[PDB]
């Protein structure tokens, strides 16, 4: 299989500067109990 746009180190992509949130097991259980 060959992609349309194979890896090319000569042109870097953009990414968000901030990382996604880290969700502890404790916080996940609160979402489960309250928000679902």
């Amino acid at each position: 299989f060959i992609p349309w746009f194979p890896y090319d180190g000569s042109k870097l992509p953009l990414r968000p500067k901030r990382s996604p949130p880290v969700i502890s097991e404790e916080a996940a259980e609160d979402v489960k109990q309250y928000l679902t």
Binding site: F1, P3, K11, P13, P21, A27
Partner: protein
């Protein structure tokens, strides 16, 4: 007569939001406890109910939308990073926008959503064709543009307090990955293909 670049951007942004949420669910990037079943593209899917995560994904895609509208995007990639922040798996959405001419009048968008439904179905069952990720993974999103990003760095900063940066090579490169194709589609307004990059 109509802004079909904006149509394609809208369709892709809604689809990528569903697809990102589902990837996080089926690859267990976040605990199952935060997800709730929904229906998108007539498929039973899973959406996070964690507010800060939902806003992060929203902000990310609102920023990509103007670039989609002007057809400046080659790839949108969901990168799964291991506990050492090294890429272990990538979901690669390759996109092109064909000549927007003599499009079909026969429920164009319903046809397109049907084609997109098949991508959601393939993501839904991909756990059985991929190796399980190690514990402790996180994710990021990479946007590959058709040209080097000076124009693009200006145009992507849509959302207050949500800056973007050029990625570093180690955010991107996996050494000789296995490529697993999931789905390809073509239409009058969008061609797209989804494959996974996996450690070999």
């Amino acid at each position: 007569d109509l802004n079909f670049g904006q149509v394609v951007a809208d369709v892709l942004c809604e689809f990528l939001e569903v697809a990102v949420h589902l990837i996080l669910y089926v690859r267990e990037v976040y605990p199952v406890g935060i997800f709730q079943k929904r229906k998108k593209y007539n498929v039973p899917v899973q959406m996070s109910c964690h507010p800060e995560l939902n806003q992060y994904i929203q902000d990310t895609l609102h920023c990509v939308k103007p670039l989609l509208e002007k057809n400046d995007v080659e790839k949108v990639v969901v990168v799964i990073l291991d506990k050492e922040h090294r890429p272990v798996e990538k979901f690669v959405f390759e996109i092109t926008q064909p000549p927007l001419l003599s499009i079909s009048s026969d429920s164009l968008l319903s046809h397109v959503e049907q084609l997109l439904a098949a991508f959601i179905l393939k993501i839904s069952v991909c756990d059985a064709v991929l190796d399980h990720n190690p514990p402790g993974c996180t994710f990021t999103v990479l946007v590959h543009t058709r040209e080097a990003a000076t124009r693009n760095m200006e145009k992507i900063q849509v959302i207050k307090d949500f800056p973007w940066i050029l990625a570093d090579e180690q955010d991107v490169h996996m050494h000789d990955p296995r490529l697993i194709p999931l789905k390809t589609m073509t239409s009058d307004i969008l061609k797209m293909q989804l494959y996974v990059e996996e450690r070999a």
